Symmetry: C4
Subunit: 161 residues, 4 copies
């Protein structure tokens, strides 16, 4: 069944969590198997309430596709990226909620800021969580994401015995 092993970073103003969501397959009637819904690396941001305590109730999610992951793992020290998502895309509720994830180098080069911005035009809200990530932490993510990439793409099914 499920497995819950997130890599988490807890900082002053918010927490950040990351974990793979594996792809789903379908057993063709030809006998073989076929990849159905794509894996992602799910990012969870949540707010620090009171003192070193965190409000899981107010979390926001951002799903990194294979291609966004490749974008993060191939980032230089001075590079930055920005991803834009609509959860209710190609559906009835589109344009209402808008998420943007930005990864920017801090001035020192000592790391990066990762922030999730959520604008909800239905509930008339505007949230923003930012978490600083050291060079070491981002190194864990780079290495963990690279490990995970083949798996969310379903390439770990190509094995000899």
């Amino acid at each position: 069944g499920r497995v819950f092993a997130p890599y988490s970073v807890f900082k002053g103003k918010a927490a950040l969590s990351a974990e793979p969501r594996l792809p789903t397959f379908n057993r063709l009637d030809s006998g073989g198997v076929k990849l159905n819904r794509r894996g992602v690396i799910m990012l969870t941001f949540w707010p620090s309430v009171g003192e070193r305590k965190y409000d899981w109730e107010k979390r926001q999610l951002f799903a990194l596709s294979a291609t966004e992951v490749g974008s993060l793992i191939s980032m230089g020290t001075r590079d930055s990226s920005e991803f834009f998502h609509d959860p209710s895309m190609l559906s009835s509720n589109a344009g209402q909620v808008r998420k943007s994830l930005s990864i920017k180098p801090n001035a020192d080069g000592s790391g990066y800021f990762i922030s999730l911005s959520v604008v909800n035009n239905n509930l008339k809200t505007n949230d923003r969580f930012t978490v600083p990530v050291t060079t070491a932490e981002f190194a864990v993510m780079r290495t963990a994401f690279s490990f995970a990439l083949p798996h969310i793409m379903g390439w770990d099914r190509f094995t000899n015995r």
Copy 2:
């Protein structure tokens, strides 16, 4: 049985697909096992017909060997490579069909063009599919190909328990 989990890139004029084809083994009569036919990373190109629709019927294939894969994964941002294949090599139908795959940096350095050219002297045809690949996409391929390399070489059979 089979597993179908291609990494695909869909662009203006054509689509590109990539997936490992595992090596085949033979159970020696000595008891052990021996690698028989070599794995490849198969590339499939196909043409965009009408509007964001793609003509799977007109696809062309290109099989990357272990060594060609090593050539792609070790490419710098400014490097380019070109591979030349005859499907009916060392057989009766050689010289008739000629395939060439070129990976070139786009001017921006924002990625690469991958194109397959097929010249068929039997059917008197000349096809060319080109697909632009961003830095992020080519990063997925590099990471996915590196993951896959040991597997198509059959080295995933060397495992402790």
Copy 3:
């Protein structure tokens, strides 16, 4: 059960050993599984007594977290790092024992010195083991640690079949 396969470096004044300690999980009552205690890469230092012989009785341990590992694997040739640990942290016996691990480039750039310093204010002792590590050896550690990182984080549980 247990598995004992340390990578070891034996030098003039001391020995150094490194091996992963896997994370522990808990089978939720929801059916799924949940990561409980975190994996580390355990480092063991011990003193050379007499001539090319080593006093296992006087060993000192240092547990690298996921994040410390990411710090070591992402070190340039000229970089150095220093980690500080209190084994009896957040408990009753804190402040008494203090461990610090330093990884510094040797002058040549031919490698690094890895040293563990242990100050025990209970037993009134002060130990220091230093082991030089060549570029090749540190390359084994970098590659072995990167391989191990996903595993100590419990990400090897996310697998397709």
Copy 4:
């Protein structure tokens, strides 16, 4: 049982083959397991007789340890290394046979020469096989060796389920 999946390079004057030899373990009476004899990446060189044919009878072997592998995978384009081995080391027949493997950059930077030199003072012979390796081929070896490194060290036994 055995598995035979060598990566091979066939050139003008000789052939080169490479494959992992896994470590051996012992089931402790404590229940757990303990690594016994170390894995290597075995290199096999053999001479080209006549025209594109190769004399397997005259092969010479060279066993790369974990540390030698780390030395090869961390080589820059312009780096070179040289390893020296006595097969009958610490035994009665030492000093008699002497093997040396050299990896040097070719002038172009288009690759490397890998050569095995064997001097046998018992049989009064002196053999030398040299095989040029392109950047692509050496990229396969680097990637395949890095994949294999954890395995020959027995670290693939540290797995979650």
